[PDB]
Symmetry: D2
Subunit: 500 residues, 4 copies
């Protein structure tokens, strides 16, 4: 008897008490007489095409892999439910918040960012925290990170930013030169960078980290009244991080540390919890705000905008088949039921398209048919048909054009989006200098203390030292802008490494 995660097979066999083994068939259901030997003419003769038992299995085996997530490749999954503990209907009408005590099945997948499919879990990198709500009014995907902000505030830079974080095109190796060249050119990433290289940079598992929606969403109540908000879910298991020494060791001792940890916790009745809160901001305050409420590189102070309890997030069920329930799960930020809408956030606007579009590539056009993704707690009925690998009945033989005089599904005028009044030219408004220091300075100071500030600079210089000097300079100048000590301290550390 070892950890539950190790006795998977042992427990699976223990479930089959007196039941005899199933009959080994092919793909079509035909039984196999011998699957341990290939057909040949003579004991030492060639293999003939006749062996359809071989090909069948082989062929499929040849198609086991699928393209990995362009980002957030390495991750882990689990299931549970979401419970409403407080009434916040005066803000949103969403069926998911209907009444207290209302439980809604959910799905969650944690992950890293730049790391590829075989990468290690315990490494400095933001964390992925996506939640899928199977509500009556359709599925609701809340794709969030473990940090309330981000490096850039314009989607048009994302493809590049990520490129910089990955491997070099020619060498296929991590390139500090790329990582900092971009960062040193986009001083807006300062905030997030400070947060990334801090202690929260390497959480001690998926259960010891918080979660935020990150972007600014919009909420609408049964009276068409709208208000902005931010989603936050605090770990009831406490915030815990691994030291640079431990993460590095575990990095190779157990690359799937995060995976194992989560699985064993659940398998042993140690179901992980998270508390759901929302920060509210009326339209009025939205203006008075000293910054761009929709600037992903900014946060909403808890003093002027306190968190409001909403419910609880609980994970009490591991997946049965990783590939089918995790690797295949897809979250779409556009999946928002009535009561929840988007906002003028550029990064959010650009995300409304990237995901569904990429899913049609990674999984397929009809990826919403795969169980995990299928909105079973709803009733899909529209005018879409066909597509490769079309499961179900393709909606049978119902009219496939709207409108029509034959009782086919109709639109519901109560599901209408909220309307806002905008005005101005239609152009590319430069947001490069939307103040990339203030909020950062307040963080380096008040938020952190001596120890942290020291460790932080250390963490940074340890990495930034491996870049060219001309890049090192730019970065420091940006850091100095945040605070004179923030810059110098790093400079001092670099001089040491640069020395020898």
């Amino acid at each position: 008897s070892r950890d539950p995660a190790s006795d998977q097979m042992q427990h699976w066999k223990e479930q089959r008490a007196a039941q005899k083994a199933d009959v080994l068939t092919t793909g079509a259901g035909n039984p196999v007489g011998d699957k341990l030997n290939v057909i040949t003419v003579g004991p030492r003769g060639p293999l003939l095409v006749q062996d359809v038992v071989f090909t069948d299995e082989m062929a499929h085996f040849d198609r086991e892999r699928i393209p990995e997530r362009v980002v957030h490749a390495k991750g882990a999954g689990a299931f549970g439910y979401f419970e409403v503990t407080h009434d916040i209907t005066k803000y949103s009408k969403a069926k998911v918040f209907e009444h207290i005590g209302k439980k809604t099945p959910i799905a969650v997948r944690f992950s890293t960012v730049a790391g590829e499919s075989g990468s290690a879990d315990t490494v400095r990198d933001p964390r992925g925290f996506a939640v899928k709500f199977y509500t009556e009014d359709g599925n609701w995907d809340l794709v969030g990170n473990n940090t309330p902000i981000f490096f850039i505030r314009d989607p048009i830079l994302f493809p590049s930013f990520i490129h910089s974080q990955k491997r070099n095109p020619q060498t296929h190796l991590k390139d500090p030169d790329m990582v900092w060249d971009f960062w040193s050119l986009r001083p807006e990433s300062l905030h997030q960078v400070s947060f990334l290289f801090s202690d929260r940079g390497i959480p001690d598992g998926h259960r010891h980290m918080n979660g935020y929606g990150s972007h600014t969403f919009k909420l609408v109540n049964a009276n068409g009244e709208a208000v902005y908000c931010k989603f936050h879910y605090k770990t009831d298991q406490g915030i815990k991080n691994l030291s640079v020494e431990d993460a590095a060791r575990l990095s190779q001792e157990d690359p799937d540390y995060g995976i194992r940890d989560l699985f064993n916790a659940i398998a042993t009745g140690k179901y992980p919890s998270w508390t759901f809160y929302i920060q509210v901001m009326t339209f009025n305050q939205a203006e008075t705000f000293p910054f761009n409420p929709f600037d992903l590189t900014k946060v909403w102070p808890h003093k002027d905008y306190p968190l409001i309890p909403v419910g609880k997030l609980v994970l009490n069920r591991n997946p049965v088949n990783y590939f089918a329930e995790v690797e295949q799960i897809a979250f779409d930020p556009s999946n928002m039921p009535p009561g929840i809408e988007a906002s003028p956030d550029k990064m959010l606007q650009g995300r409304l398209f990237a995901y569904p579009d990429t899913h049609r590539h990674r999984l397929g056009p009809n990826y919403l048919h795969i169980p995990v993704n299928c909105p079973y707690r709803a009733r899909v009925a529209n005018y879409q048909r066909d597509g490769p690998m079309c499961m179900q009945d393709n909606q049978g033989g119902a009219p496939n054009y709207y409108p029509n005089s034959f009782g086919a599904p109709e639109q519901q005028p109560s599901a209408l989006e909220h309307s806002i009044q905008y005005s101005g030219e239609v152009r590319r408004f430069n947001t490069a200098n939307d103040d990339n220091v203030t909020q950062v300075r307040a963080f380096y100071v008040n938020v952190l203390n001596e120890e942290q500030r020291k460790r932080l600079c250390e963490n940074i210089a340890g990495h930034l030292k491996d870049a060219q000097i001309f890049i090192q300079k730019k970065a420091v100048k940006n850091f100095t802008e945040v605070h004179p000590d923030y810059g110098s301290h790093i400079q001092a550390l670099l001089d040491k490494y640069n020395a020898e």
Copy 2:
């Protein structure tokens, strides 16, 4: 009011008595407030990405199409069942023939060959007749034509043959030069060609034609006793053909004539029936045979090898969704359950690979998950895992390696194939001159009569006339070899057009 096929929508609505209209939702299940208008900034402003309702619908619509079958593109489908009427267990042990009265669900798809997705039904071209059996011991796919023979007897020429029958690479139009060049170079196709251009060349619907497995298959009884055979299923609706004049008209009047014809039949309780027969040849007669018993360009005479009743084939249900139940159904000749095996037939040997292979591209690696294809009458339990669009539970968390000491599915020693002894060199044995006239002559003479003979020659000349002269010559030479009158009669008609 009108034919049931025309009142589809009307009947669908009629089925919804008091029921109210379902709520229109996006793909994720989210309800729509208005699907008749896109979101814009101002009544005359641009469109914004925010409208996911629009993109959701559009995006999917942009991915409705899938690659059509490389062959037998235009077809029709229907469902029914197979019923055993006579006991033939002394030949095969297949669970499908188990006991008399045993009914097994089946699927059928009729089709043409060269014609693309938008082609017309009533056209001179072989007909496709595939039957999928959902038996306990797995799915059984009997893919067959409406003709007992074929043009070539070697798979390595199929790709070319089909090419010659399709459009020209540069112009994209049917090229008579291509069609006859290949045929004039492969006299073995004479048999099938003679069949093709005869009256049966254009059946009057899919219900008035017979079906054959064509290939020589092997049967294995409960005692490891093997014997060869050939499947035949006769139309209980009689054999009817359309005249050149009629087929031409219908070719444009109603291109989907076949589809509509079948659909209304079933819809009107006029369920089509087919009688199942099998020709048995023992291993002994297998040698005595004057030809190659596995030669696809040769038939088994009903005199020496009479048909043996097996059962009935009935189609009593139209598909609910064409794309889902028909355009997506896949048939694999490899799908043969215990009791039925393949044979040394080259053309079939090459067919054992091509289908499953082509299916993984047309539909996908896990196409066997698509309902119509999934062998629901059996229990799939192996060590295959993953693959794009993986439905089901991927077999859950069960051992994924054989062997193993954890109770995973095991092989069944009783499903072992039948063993045969072979011997000789492993090379490319030329089968180009395996006699391409003997049976063909006996066809042109005894099988047909004055009228048919005349019409046939006419049908041929009418087509071959559009090809180059030097090609015409070669073809005539090959016909003359079948029968002196066969050729000359053609040559005569040709001179007229050519003149």
Copy 3:
């Protein structure tokens, strides 16, 4: 002898003078000893996997097909060039209009709409006229129709519209009930419908018809000044249309009529020509305009906005390989270089996404790498990388992020788009009643005459008759709205067939 199209193979062979035949290799380049026979153990033995020559060919053959266009499936292509004859640089700064006498290689593909890959050419249906300009400032695609307007003015209905125009979900047969139920619910379709069922409904070939960009575009000169416009290209061969009878016959006699006709013309130095014109409208008139200048269901009168000659369109080259140069060619209405931009036109706004989106599914994510589609007359240099089937050098080992301090490509501030001021709410503005009879009436009256009016109603009634009475009424109510005579005349004809 015969037409150049029929003697394809012949001329190809004639091109190989004393040149000996190339050596037949496999896929990887290895020579083939015999491709006419498969490998087996003994003459009558089974086939073995060893024969990779067989599999290599067979497999590929099993993957020849690819999803056909979701719309405008059946088409024909040709190549030529565009030449500027008049100076309009005072309107647009586009490099393609740079100076008079400037020639720019082009690509063109004609098509139908609902008809699948196998359908016939000579059929009542709007025609597709796309043009690809291989300019220095990138490729510019001018995806147009043979009609200046369309059935609907909102993209969110298109999916549905094309659905109704196609096959029934269950029967898979054209369904008049759908076709008219939709049209009868969207009176905005009247205009185009009236045009479609007119004599221009079935052009005699692709060379005897006009083309228009249909949508309203925006033009910007070297001084940031922008004006709206509409593209029209008239056939220098004249407007010719086949009669109902003729088209019907040809619909089956030669389903590739349009393909054959165009190929031969080019083949015999009868290079088809079209003249390029443009309708200009300043921002001022854009307001005064009694209608919505961006309403695809409207037209700009020639009296108020005359056509202005710009250049000539010449097709002087047939494709060498249909599949490679035509079936694979992709047009993106989004591909507009500096000097030409989009407009508030909802229909056009939605198209900006639909095309590139579907191309990545039909052909692949790197379809811009396919020769015909690649913008060879320009230098592609960005930060995009990887992707399935990545041809070229994936841009070598260059910085793949922007910005950077390493010399990678930089943005050109001279290629900025034109900025326009907007304002208002962001919602779905209902544009279902933007007047659907005023211009339509002006067409039925002044545009046509006695004959055409008679023929039109005839054409319509002949079709709308096969629909359900309750549906028949609706349509008529709509036609009566356009003109009392328009509706009644149809009504009269209907009562006849309904009898």
Copy 4:
């Protein structure tokens, strides 16, 4: 300053002396005015679809990934050439061995086995060593490992094996239970296992390990004379392995150790070298052979079958774009030009299908079009056409069927394969007990010494200990068979960890 590998971007910038930066364009070649800001209505307004610049870049970025190799995912690549140093023409007629001094361009990709794309290099696992020769007679792919043998000898077990080597279906974590349960059930794996857990198990880079073809191949000379053989390429840099402690540290310090190490070597004119040898066995000795000459779990003793020098392998060129030149390169063992053929080896037989098949899925049906894969030193001319992403001219408008009378490519009777006479029943001959200890016992003793023995038993026990007891027992049992001391020693170590 730093290693060449780190100063990539720097050196690329250096190459661009006085040249200005290229113009940043979209996919279609259209220039971009600002790629640092998305278009929105007002500074804080929503984003609109008009931003094709955004969508273009975005959409593509969304399709950057492609399925990774099912096996050997984490690897490195490089280019160089092969040079014949010795004459062996008396054995094979392959154009690559033509004459001494003949240089042929080659491609190489080294790799691990179970580890995924992001895994670490310095890990205990066999090493991938594939070579692609761009010969005149087509491409020749010699796909080999760093070990001369393998765990299993029948391909039908491969899928399972690899399954056991990877992650658990439920937990997704390596499962020592799976790894050993299979291994303990297939005693034939012993040989390879012993090698894997020896010091050669974790090579210090790709340049310090040897390469073998592993399988038994057949050679044919100009006079149809055939002999069997084995391929071996020793490293001219000597064999060097990292310690368990060292590999463990590098395993996290630099997971791309192997990639980096190789790149730099080449970048600093330290071009790695490998010598090519072959082991010949006539048909006669093939029989007298105490074992099955085609048993992949056996090796050919250098005393009875000495290495024969053939040439030199050199790698003098790094890739420019990893994705394009390395991640996309595909090696097909089937690719073997005249002179080199396969053998009855079951493991090889099954590989003749697996690769070309898996490639058609991972890259595409026309993957042989991607440069690195295209056989540029040969002329591809066959009868294959179409296929998704069809680059080139699809062979233009040439006859697409065989045979034909128009000068299309023709087969070369001199490229016919070598024929062998086989005899016996066609069934699944069990090969589970083909002696799994003899050659292993010889390895454990004479091959290794005290140190190695101890270190091997150590390395094994270190891993085998994390498996269930019952599994531990079976393993030891198998080990004991090899040699009493082999098993006991392991039993000893085990007892300690177990207690």
